[PDB]
Amino acid sequence: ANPLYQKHIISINDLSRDDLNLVLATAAKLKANPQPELLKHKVIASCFFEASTRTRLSFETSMHRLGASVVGFSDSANTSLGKKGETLADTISVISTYVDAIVMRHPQEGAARLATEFSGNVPVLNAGDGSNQHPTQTLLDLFTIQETQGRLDNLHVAMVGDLKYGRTVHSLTQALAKFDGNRFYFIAPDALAMPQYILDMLDEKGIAWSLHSSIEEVMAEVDILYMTRVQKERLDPSEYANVKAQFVLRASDLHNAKANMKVLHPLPRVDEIATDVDKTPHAWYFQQAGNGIFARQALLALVLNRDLVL
Amino acid sequence: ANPLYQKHIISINDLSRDDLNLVLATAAKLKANPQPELLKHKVIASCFFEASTRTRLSFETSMHRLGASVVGFSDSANTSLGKKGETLADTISVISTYVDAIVMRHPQEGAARLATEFSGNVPVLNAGDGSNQHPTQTLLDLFTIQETQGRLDNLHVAMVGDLKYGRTVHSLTQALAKFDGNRFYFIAPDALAMPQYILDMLDEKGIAWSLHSSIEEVMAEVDILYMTRVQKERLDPSEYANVKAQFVLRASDLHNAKANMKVLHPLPRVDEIATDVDKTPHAWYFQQAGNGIFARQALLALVLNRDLVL
Amino acid sequence: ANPLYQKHIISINDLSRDDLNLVLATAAKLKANPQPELLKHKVIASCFFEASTRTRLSFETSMHRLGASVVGFSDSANTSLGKKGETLADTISVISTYVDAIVMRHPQEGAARLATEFSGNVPVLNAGDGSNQHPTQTLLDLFTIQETQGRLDNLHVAMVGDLKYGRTVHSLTQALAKFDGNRFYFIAPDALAMPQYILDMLDEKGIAWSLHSSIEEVMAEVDILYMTRVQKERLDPSEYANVKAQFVLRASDLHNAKANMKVLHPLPRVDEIATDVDKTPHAWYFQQAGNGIFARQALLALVLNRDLVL
Amino acid sequence: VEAIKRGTVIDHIPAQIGFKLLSLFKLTETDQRITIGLNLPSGEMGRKDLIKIENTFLSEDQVDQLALYAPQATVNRIDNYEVVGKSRPSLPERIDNVLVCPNSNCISHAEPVSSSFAVRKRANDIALKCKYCEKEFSHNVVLAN
Amino acid sequence: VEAIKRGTVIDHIPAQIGFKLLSLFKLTETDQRITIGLNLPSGEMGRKDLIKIENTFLSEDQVDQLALYAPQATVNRIDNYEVVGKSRPSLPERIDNVLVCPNSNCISHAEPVSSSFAVRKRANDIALKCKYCEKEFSHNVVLAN
Ligand SMILES: Nc1ncnc2c1ncn2[C@@H]1O[C@H](COP(=O)(O)OP(=O)(O)OP(=O)(O)O)[C@@H](O)[C@H]1O
Ligand SMILES: Nc1ncnc2c1ncn2[C@@H]1O[C@H](COP(=O)(O)OP(=O)(O)OP(=O)(O)O)[C@@H](O)[C@H]1O
Ligand SMILES: O=C(O)C[C@H](NC(=O)CP(=O)(O)O)C(=O)O
Ligand SMILES: O=C(O)C[C@H](NC(=O)CP(=O)(O)O)C(=O)O
Ligand SMILES: O=C(O)C[C@H](NC(=O)CP(=O)(O)O)C(=O)O
Ligand SMILES: [Zn+2]
Ligand SMILES: [Zn+2]
């Protein structure tokens, strides 16, 4: 079987560079030659316990493009966990008797990992667990960086905004750190800085990173400008001074951008990216979102189908 | 390609008589000879930002009867628009990278039109936008009027209740005005009268219309009695005297009804149609609702499938 | 008549050193020799639009001790301003046809000043207006300092806590600046610093003040340690990191205090003064509160009587 | 004083309209020299307003937007001190950007789109139909930004 | 053309301020002849705006407000075609009604009173202290509300 067959996909920290490249290679193949019946006779649970537009709808669309069926919920309020007091453990224990895989997003860190301890032989795919990990975001991000830059090595990557609570940047930094020669610029409010366990990991691998207080400092050298939303729903009340976006990218800020540079954003955006950016050649956040289909199809295929696709 | 292939379906004001007849002709064909795989490999978004029973469930049932898959939501509360502050524009910008068409209902007038400005090559079908338009209601209504009356020309049509906020009657009046010799009776509270832009349009085409203060005035001549619900969720507080239905149709009111006459109602009804009407031969609101399947199948087929069905 | 007869008491900025001394001398005399009939036949309004314990109760007790009657309200929810949409202007316009003086506290800066514009010949006494002024607190504070220190000049005075929103310290600093040779130590979070307009005033009068990051820094030299509560009901959400007391005075912190030093606090305290301070000889906040009676009686007597002989 | 070498002269503006034109079309948001005369004697009109803008030109569409406020105005295009073109505004098909839809429930108030209204003659008034909500209003009650 | 016999010429207005004064003082709400120059050359200040109004003089309030909006402007009064009075507008001690206190918790926002600010000339900017809340601000913060 392929190395990802029947594997839980919980944290980028658990995956290797080879695993990441495998997903991307599979994504390329399915995009060139769709296999609309590859997951025929699979039923997959889509269990979202906090809000989502892109992640849930792209995952379900991917399941349908591969011929699988979908059950689940987008709100926990009308599950028995919502109204009758059921634990998450018991919820997973029953759902795992029904379906071939479970895709879940949850407001508490660790929820996906917990699910694996109750799902038996059923794979859990983490669609986001509190401010911890977001591995399928990272897969589409890498696909998008590869598409636009031609490589995942030796890149200048700026990450901007709420790095403390951004599960997106925890996962993406851990992922890009598995490739060679990448350099990171972190542009965050002091209260929302990249967590030490990420920084320690970079130092371990001998990867260059530095803090900056403005986008303009780094604009001339970045290949990828990764903007993020302030995770207001994760903030402690003591952190409320940072609700508003501290860095706002506008079209005029892009004068000295490299021609190859792309502006990415896992979305949704509030005001951190002005709408005048949308029409510039550097804007790629919507193309990025569309790549979620190819990345999420690839992952489903690899986890649920024994043979490598070609 | 057929004239409606890949077209947005936003307002009856944008469609011609030929467009309307095309949908109806296609509805007849699919009803006589179902094509359960016509939209196989399509994935369609069903995005309802306000309440619905008939419109959403009939649309989704139609997608399934044609072999398409469905993703979406029936509530905006757990989308990223609901919880993370995302604009509708950005919501459409991402969903349009996933699906082959978007069906949407929204509490603000103009929402479907706005969606078309962000959906790229993806068709938007307006399932209702505030008190503005409801074009697929009109398609099933016309199918139902045609079925029961044998024509769409030279009919006596009464519309009763909340005409100001009824998106149903805005669309249906504009549609019937594209056929010849129809005559309208408007029975509404003064505060909830048919809007001037509808009346001006009638005057332009030289179509006879008149206001009446009772159903009984017109009962002897109407072929179609179109009853409506007071759109209480659209009312300004200053209009609250009109919450209760001002006209209540009961079985006894139908003594002098023409034998061919049908009572229609886009539903839901509150008290404007007493339950004793349900058993009379004039009641056709449930048959009407069932025709939503044929009209909505036809529209999906025409928009998403290049060739004319036969 | 006496200089304060029939005067509004809105801001310490409108009072002279002589005015303040007059109130303190009068308070000393009333404390020594009560005048239970001084305000006989006066009816006074006590109008509190935000919460109070000390200020309202000591004010009303003071009126009763001088023989006056009291009418008013301790919240505005059942006034016509609270239920019928009435403006503060009109509220003052009618109440001032009833009573001989108006004592008012209000959550908006400037409310007391505004009241003077509608009260005609009826004196208004400001019991607190938003985060602006609190002149009667300053009167009892000065009285207490004078009692325990023997003087109002050449003092070393520390003010700790929320100095930005503390109407108490805005009034107190202004009053103490009208005396000679006082020295100020301001110990506050950067976000809640003593406002610049207070500092500029101190500069223009050539008064020495300095900032400090800890109490112990100045403990050995202070005659008065004035502690304050974080005014959480005034904070902007961006300032919520400051809700907890940054500086917490405990009994152990007093080891190198001057023997004569008094700990004052206008109250209520949350956690900025631990209860183990209460039993020490330096704790004087309850005695301070007790002195509200004599200062407020003095003020009422001077405003409502042409002259006093005692 | 001092006639212009090139630019645009908007002549025969009705009284009380010159200022409205300047406000609405943001005509003074420029570094180009502008000359304005208000309540000037006309003879043809009795009283008129006059706007002169240097090094600045109006397309036919831009000229047409004036039709709502000054249908009888003359727009003179100036080059090398001479009038090289005279045009009168004609009623446009649409009015975009500058107006605000009076419907409080219109999507245009909440979202990043520009306002837009179809223009038509109704009786002796002008009716504006919002592209988004499709409601229609007399131009009198459709306010500007 | 047609120098005026009697009225007012406001000179030396900073660029991008002339149009603002026309609005704030409602100067175009008259039948009196007006001429306006915007972005006129100025030896004295590079570029300037200029407003001429026949048979009309600034009210006392308008003169007071002018000292805030355009300190270095020149107010010329004219009679029988001659400049009779000339001065930079006199700064007042108070200014009422027109300004808005930037303190959002000021009582002045919710209640039927006229705004009022103590005006004191300072070194670099000018200070406005609110009569009600007693807070003081730079006129830069009070203006452009
Ligand atoms: N070089 C210029 N600089 C400034 N203004 C000019 C210039 N040339 C023409 N104008 C102005 O343009 C307007 C029209 O000029 P034109 O020579 O066509 O007069 P006209 O024929 O009387 O105009 P109309 O007949 O349309 O009323 C006049 O108001 C005039 O002041
Ligand atoms: N009769 C008039 N009609 C219209 N404008 C006039 C009249 N007299 C003077 N002005 C204008 O008033 C302004 C001041 O005129 P003045 O003759 O004082 O010029 P000045 O000596 O250069 O003044 P300053 O030294 O203030 O620049 C000038 O811009 C001028 O065009
Ligand atoms: O929410 C963000 O800002 C980033 C990130 N966003 C998404 O996954 C997109 P969505 O919430 O629409 O599925 C996330 O962590 O949820
Ligand atoms: O709601 C009405 O009364 C008429 C009309 N009704 C429907 O479309 C039926 P439903 O809301 O169940 O989809 C509408 O405009 O939504
Ligand atoms: O509330 C404070 O912390 C200080 C001060 N406290 C008082 O006046 C005491 P009280 O609110 O009980 O009348 C105030 O400004 O209201
Ligand atoms: Zn609109
Ligand atoms: Zn104020």
PDB file of N, CA and C in Angstrom, chain B residues 105-167:
ATOM      1  N   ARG B 105     -30.177  31.673  -1.874  1.00  0.00           N
ATOM      2  CA  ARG B 105     -31.221  32.542  -1.324  1.00  0.00           C
ATOM      3  C   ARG B 105     -30.581  33.421  -0.254  1.00  0.00           C
ATOM      4  N   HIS B 106     -31.007  34.684  -0.163  1.00  0.00           N
ATOM      5  CA  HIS B 106     -30.338  35.647   0.713  1.00  0.00           C
ATOM      6  C   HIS B 106     -31.327  36.727   1.183  1.00  0.00           C
ATOM      7  N   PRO B 107     -31.184  37.206   2.437  1.00  0.00           N
ATOM      8  CA  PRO B 107     -32.179  38.156   2.957  1.00  0.00           C
ATOM      9  C   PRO B 107     -32.052  39.584   2.425  1.00  0.00           C
ATOM     10  N   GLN B 108     -30.953  39.906   1.747  1.00  0.00           N
ATOM     11  CA  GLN B 108     -30.818  41.236   1.155  1.00  0.00           C
ATOM     12  C   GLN B 108     -31.136  41.233  -0.331  1.00  0.00           C
ATOM     13  N   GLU B 109     -31.918  42.220  -0.785  1.00  0.00           N
ATOM     14  CA  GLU B 109     -32.159  42.386  -2.216  1.00  0.00           C
ATOM     15  C   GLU B 109     -30.835  42.636  -2.925  1.00  0.00           C
ATOM     16  N   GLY B 110     -30.644  41.985  -4.072  1.00  0.00           N
ATOM     17  CA  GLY B 110     -29.482  42.237  -4.912  1.00  0.00           C
ATOM     18  C   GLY B 110     -28.351  41.238  -4.729  1.00  0.00           C
ATOM     19  N   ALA B 111     -28.500  40.348  -3.751  1.00  0.00           N
ATOM     20  CA  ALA B 111     -27.423  39.438  -3.381  1.00  0.00           C
ATOM     21  C   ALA B 111     -27.055  38.519  -4.525  1.00  0.00           C
ATOM     22  N   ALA B 112     -28.055  37.979  -5.214  1.00  0.00           N
ATOM     23  CA  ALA B 112     -27.759  37.077  -6.325  1.00  0.00           C
ATOM     24  C   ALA B 112     -27.033  37.837  -7.443  1.00  0.00           C
ATOM     25  N   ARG B 113     -27.524  39.023  -7.788  1.00  0.00           N
ATOM     26  CA  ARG B 113     -26.837  39.854  -8.774  1.00  0.00           C
ATOM     27  C   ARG B 113     -25.390  40.125  -8.361  1.00  0.00           C
ATOM     28  N   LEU B 114     -25.167  40.436  -7.092  1.00  0.00           N
ATOM     29  CA  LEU B 114     -23.801  40.651  -6.631  1.00  0.00           C
ATOM     30  C   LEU B 114     -22.959  39.397  -6.833  1.00  0.00           C
ATOM     31  N   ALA B 115     -23.509  38.243  -6.473  1.00  0.00           N
ATOM     32  CA  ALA B 115     -22.768  36.997  -6.619  1.00  0.00           C
ATOM     33  C   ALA B 115     -22.245  36.813  -8.039  1.00  0.00           C
ATOM     34  N   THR B 116     -23.019  37.238  -9.043  1.00  0.00           N
ATOM     35  CA  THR B 116     -22.590  37.032 -10.432  1.00  0.00           C
ATOM     36  C   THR B 116     -21.342  37.831 -10.738  1.00  0.00           C
ATOM     37  N   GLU B 117     -21.105  38.879  -9.963  1.00  0.00           N
ATOM     38  CA  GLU B 117     -19.951  39.721 -10.231  1.00  0.00           C
ATOM     39  C   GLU B 117     -18.692  39.131  -9.605  1.00  0.00           C
ATOM     40  N   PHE B 118     -18.851  38.045  -8.847  1.00  0.00           N
ATOM     41  CA  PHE B 118     -17.700  37.380  -8.239  1.00  0.00           C
ATOM     42  C   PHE B 118     -17.572  35.902  -8.567  1.00  0.00           C
ATOM     43  N   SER B 119     -18.529  35.347  -9.313  1.00  0.00           N
ATOM     44  CA  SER B 119     -18.548  33.895  -9.534  1.00  0.00           C
ATOM     45  C   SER B 119     -17.852  33.465 -10.823  1.00  0.00           C
ATOM     46  N   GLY B 120     -17.222  34.399 -11.532  1.00  0.00           N
ATOM     47  CA  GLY B 120     -16.506  34.038 -12.756  1.00  0.00           C
ATOM     48  C   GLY B 120     -17.404  33.348 -13.777  1.00  0.00           C
ATOM     49  N   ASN B 121     -16.970  32.202 -14.291  1.00  0.00           N
ATOM     50  CA  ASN B 121     -17.795  31.446 -15.238  1.00  0.00           C
ATOM     51  C   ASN B 121     -18.855  30.554 -14.596  1.00  0.00           C
ATOM     52  N   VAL B 122     -19.082  30.704 -13.295  1.00  0.00           N
ATOM     53  CA  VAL B 122     -20.021  29.810 -12.626  1.00  0.00           C
ATOM     54  C   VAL B 122     -21.395  30.474 -12.526  1.00  0.00           C
ATOM     55  N   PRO B 123     -22.434  29.806 -13.058  1.00  0.00           N
ATOM     56  CA  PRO B 123     -23.787  30.384 -13.077  1.00  0.00           C
ATOM     57  C   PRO B 123     -24.388  30.488 -11.687  1.00  0.00           C
ATOM     58  N   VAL B 124     -25.070  31.601 -11.422  1.00  0.00           N
ATOM     59  CA  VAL B 124     -25.783  31.796 -10.167  1.00  0.00           C
ATOM     60  C   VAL B 124     -27.280  31.692 -10.457  1.00  0.00           C
ATOM     61  N   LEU B 125     -27.982  30.876  -9.681  1.00  0.00           N
ATOM     62  CA  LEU B 125     -29.433  30.762  -9.805  1.00  0.00           C
ATOM     63  C   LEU B 125     -30.063  31.365  -8.541  1.00  0.00           C
ATOM     64  N   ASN B 126     -30.868  32.411  -8.713  1.00  0.00           N
ATOM     65  CA  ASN B 126     -31.437  33.164  -7.574  1.00  0.00           C
ATOM     66  C   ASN B 126     -32.615  32.409  -6.990  1.00  0.00           C
ATOM     67  N   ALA B 127     -32.435  31.886  -5.783  1.00  0.00           N
ATOM     68  CA  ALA B 127     -33.526  31.207  -5.105  1.00  0.00           C
ATOM     69  C   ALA B 127     -34.289  32.194  -4.221  1.00  0.00           C
ATOM     70  N   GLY B 128     -34.052  33.494  -4.414  1.00  0.00           N
ATOM     71  CA  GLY B 128     -34.766  34.527  -3.662  1.00  0.00           C
ATOM     72  C   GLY B 128     -33.811  35.541  -3.040  1.00  0.00           C
ATOM     73  N   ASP B 129     -34.014  36.814  -3.332  1.00  0.00           N
ATOM     74  CA  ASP B 129     -33.127  37.824  -2.767  1.00  0.00           C
ATOM     75  C   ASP B 129     -33.952  38.924  -2.105  1.00  0.00           C
ATOM     76  N   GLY B 130     -34.045  38.861  -0.777  1.00  0.00           N
ATOM     77  CA  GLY B 130     -34.880  39.795  -0.043  1.00  0.00           C
ATOM     78  C   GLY B 130     -36.280  39.812  -0.629  1.00  0.00           C
ATOM     79  N   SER B 131     -36.858  41.003  -0.766  1.00  0.00           N
ATOM     80  CA  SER B 131     -38.206  41.101  -1.312  1.00  0.00           C
ATOM     81  C   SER B 131     -38.146  41.370  -2.802  1.00  0.00           C
ATOM     82  N   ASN B 132     -37.000  41.113  -3.426  1.00  0.00           N
ATOM     83  CA  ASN B 132     -36.857  41.454  -4.846  1.00  0.00           C
ATOM     84  C   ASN B 132     -37.438  40.407  -5.803  1.00  0.00           C
ATOM     85  N   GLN B 133     -36.627  39.418  -6.173  1.00  0.00           N
ATOM     86  CA  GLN B 133     -37.022  38.449  -7.193  1.00  0.00           C
ATOM     87  C   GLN B 133     -37.028  37.020  -6.688  1.00  0.00           C
ATOM     88  N   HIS B 134     -37.800  36.178  -7.361  1.00  0.00           N
ATOM     89  CA  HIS B 134     -37.871  34.755  -7.032  1.00  0.00           C
ATOM     90  C   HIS B 134     -38.171  34.059  -8.353  1.00  0.00           C
ATOM     91  N   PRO B 135     -37.180  34.029  -9.253  1.00  0.00           N
ATOM     92  CA  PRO B 135     -37.491  33.560 -10.604  1.00  0.00           C
ATOM     93  C   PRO B 135     -37.856  32.089 -10.709  1.00  0.00           C
ATOM     94  N   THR B 136     -37.337  31.215  -9.845  1.00  0.00           N
ATOM     95  CA  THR B 136     -37.687  29.793  -9.987  1.00  0.00           C
ATOM     96  C   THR B 136     -39.073  29.509  -9.432  1.00  0.00           C
ATOM     97  N   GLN B 137     -39.533  30.318  -8.482  1.00  0.00           N
ATOM     98  CA  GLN B 137     -40.947  30.257  -8.096  1.00  0.00           C
ATOM     99  C   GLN B 137     -41.817  30.533  -9.323  1.00  0.00           C
ATOM    100  N   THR B 138     -41.435  31.555 -10.080  1.00  0.00           N
ATOM    101  CA  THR B 138     -42.235  31.955 -11.229  1.00  0.00           C
ATOM    102  C   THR B 138     -42.271  30.844 -12.282  1.00  0.00           C
ATOM    103  N   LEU B 139     -41.156  30.143 -12.443  1.00  0.00           N
ATOM    104  CA  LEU B 139     -41.114  29.060 -13.421  1.00  0.00           C
ATOM    105  C   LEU B 139     -42.072  27.943 -13.033  1.00  0.00           C
ATOM    106  N   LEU B 140     -42.108  27.551 -11.760  1.00  0.00           N
ATOM    107  CA  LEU B 140     -43.036  26.495 -11.353  1.00  0.00           C
ATOM    108  C   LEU B 140     -44.481  27.014 -11.396  1.00  0.00           C
ATOM    109  N   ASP B 141     -44.673  28.288 -11.048  1.00  0.00           N
ATOM    110  CA  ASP B 141     -45.993  28.908 -11.111  1.00  0.00           C
ATOM    111  C   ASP B 141     -46.545  28.869 -12.532  1.00  0.00           C
ATOM    112  N   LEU B 142     -45.713  29.249 -13.495  1.00  0.00           N
ATOM    113  CA  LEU B 142     -46.133  29.245 -14.903  1.00  0.00           C
ATOM    114  C   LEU B 142     -46.435  27.815 -15.371  1.00  0.00           C
ATOM    115  N   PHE B 143     -45.597  26.868 -14.967  1.00  0.00           N
ATOM    116  CA  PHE B 143     -45.848  25.472 -15.290  1.00  0.00           C
ATOM    117  C   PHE B 143     -47.221  25.070 -14.747  1.00  0.00           C
ATOM    118  N   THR B 144     -47.516  25.479 -13.517  1.00  0.00           N
ATOM    119  CA  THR B 144     -48.775  25.127 -12.861  1.00  0.00           C
ATOM    120  C   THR B 144     -49.986  25.820 -13.496  1.00  0.00           C
ATOM    121  N   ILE B 145     -49.814  27.080 -13.876  1.00  0.00           N
ATOM    122  CA  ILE B 145     -50.901  27.801 -14.533  1.00  0.00           C
ATOM    123  C   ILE B 145     -51.184  27.180 -15.897  1.00  0.00           C
ATOM    124  N   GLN B 146     -50.119  26.867 -16.626  1.00  0.00           N
ATOM    125  CA  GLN B 146     -50.238  26.212 -17.925  1.00  0.00           C
ATOM    126  C   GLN B 146     -50.932  24.852 -17.814  1.00  0.00           C
ATOM    127  N   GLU B 147     -50.498  24.053 -16.842  1.00  0.00           N
ATOM    128  CA  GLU B 147     -51.067  22.725 -16.592  1.00  0.00           C
ATOM    129  C   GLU B 147     -52.574  22.775 -16.344  1.00  0.00           C
ATOM    130  N   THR B 148     -53.005  23.725 -15.520  1.00  0.00           N
ATOM    131  CA  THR B 148     -54.389  23.771 -15.073  1.00  0.00           C
ATOM    132  C   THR B 148     -55.301  24.595 -15.980  1.00  0.00           C
ATOM    133  N   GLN B 149     -54.732  25.556 -16.697  1.00  0.00           N
ATOM    134  CA  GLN B 149     -55.537  26.457 -17.517  1.00  0.00           C
ATOM    135  C   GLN B 149     -55.395  26.166 -19.001  1.00  0.00           C
ATOM    136  N   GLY B 150     -54.339  25.444 -19.373  1.00  0.00           N
ATOM    137  CA  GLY B 150     -54.117  25.094 -20.768  1.00  0.00           C
ATOM    138  C   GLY B 150     -53.439  26.179 -21.590  1.00  0.00           C
ATOM    139  N   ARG B 151     -53.114  27.299 -20.949  1.00  0.00           N
ATOM    140  CA  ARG B 151     -52.467  28.419 -21.635  1.00  0.00           C
ATOM    141  C   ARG B 151     -51.877  29.413 -20.633  1.00  0.00           C
ATOM    142  N   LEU B 152     -51.087  30.359 -21.135  1.00  0.00           N
ATOM    143  CA  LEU B 152     -50.517  31.423 -20.308  1.00  0.00           C
ATOM    144  C   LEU B 152     -50.964  32.780 -20.840  1.00  0.00           C
ATOM    145  N   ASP B 153     -51.825  32.740 -21.861  1.00  0.00           N
ATOM    146  CA  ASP B 153     -52.380  33.941 -22.497  1.00  0.00           C
ATOM    147  C   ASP B 153     -53.826  34.151 -22.102  1.00  0.00           C
ATOM    148  N   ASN B 154     -54.269  35.406 -22.147  1.00  0.00           N
ATOM    149  CA  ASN B 154     -55.677  35.742 -21.948  1.00  0.00           C
ATOM    150  C   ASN B 154     -56.289  35.156 -20.680  1.00  0.00           C
ATOM    151  N   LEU B 155     -55.569  35.298 -19.569  1.00  0.00           N
ATOM    152  CA  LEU B 155     -56.035  34.801 -18.280  1.00  0.00           C
ATOM    153  C   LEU B 155     -56.413  35.949 -17.361  1.00  0.00           C
ATOM    154  N   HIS B 156     -57.335  35.665 -16.448  1.00  0.00           N
ATOM    155  CA  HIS B 156     -57.673  36.595 -15.382  1.00  0.00           C
ATOM    156  C   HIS B 156     -56.957  36.141 -14.124  1.00  0.00           C
ATOM    157  N   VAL B 157     -56.003  36.948 -13.667  1.00  0.00           N
ATOM    158  CA  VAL B 157     -55.147  36.578 -12.541  1.00  0.00           C
ATOM    159  C   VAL B 157     -55.282  37.557 -11.371  1.00  0.00           C
ATOM    160  N   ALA B 158     -55.776  37.066 -10.236  1.00  0.00           N
ATOM    161  CA  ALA B 158     -55.833  37.875  -9.024  1.00  0.00           C
ATOM    162  C   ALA B 158     -54.639  37.553  -8.139  1.00  0.00           C
ATOM    163  N   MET B 159     -54.006  38.593  -7.610  1.00  0.00           N
ATOM    164  CA  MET B 159     -52.930  38.407  -6.649  1.00  0.00           C
ATOM    165  C   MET B 159     -53.316  39.094  -5.350  1.00  0.00           C
ATOM    166  N   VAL B 160     -53.177  38.372  -4.242  1.00  0.00           N
ATOM    167  CA  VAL B 160     -53.781  38.782  -2.981  1.00  0.00           C
ATOM    168  C   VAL B 160     -52.765  38.755  -1.855  1.00  0.00           C
ATOM    169  N   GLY B 161     -52.795  39.782  -1.006  1.00  0.00           N
ATOM    170  CA  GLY B 161     -51.996  39.786   0.205  1.00  0.00           C
ATOM    171  C   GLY B 161     -50.878  40.801   0.158  1.00  0.00           C
ATOM    172  N   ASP B 162     -49.680  40.373   0.539  1.00  0.00           N
ATOM    173  CA  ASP B 162     -48.544  41.277   0.620  1.00  0.00           C
ATOM    174  C   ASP B 162     -47.821  41.354  -0.736  1.00  0.00           C
ATOM    175  N   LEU B 163     -48.219  42.317  -1.557  1.00  0.00           N
ATOM    176  CA  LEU B 163     -47.656  42.461  -2.899  1.00  0.00           C
ATOM    177  C   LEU B 163     -46.388  43.291  -2.898  1.00  0.00           C
ATOM    178  N   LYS B 164     -46.249  44.155  -1.899  1.00  0.00           N
ATOM    179  CA  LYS B 164     -45.069  45.008  -1.799  1.00  0.00           C
ATOM    180  C   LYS B 164     -43.816  44.179  -1.582  1.00  0.00           C
ATOM    181  N   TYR B 165     -43.867  43.273  -0.607  1.00  0.00           N
ATOM    182  CA  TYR B 165     -42.685  42.476  -0.261  1.00  0.00           C
ATOM    183  C   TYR B 165     -42.647  41.090  -0.891  1.00  0.00           C
ATOM    184  N   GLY B 166     -43.706  40.721  -1.603  1.00  0.00           N
ATOM    185  CA  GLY B 166     -43.736  39.411  -2.231  1.00  0.00           C
ATOM    186  C   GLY B 166     -42.836  39.328  -3.458  1.00  0.00           C
ATOM    187  N   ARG B 167     -41.645  38.747  -3.302  1.00  0.00           N
ATOM    188  CA  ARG B 167     -40.758  38.523  -4.453  1.00  0.00           C
ATOM    189  C   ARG B 167     -41.424  37.612  -5.477  1.00  0.00           C
TER     190      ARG B 167
END
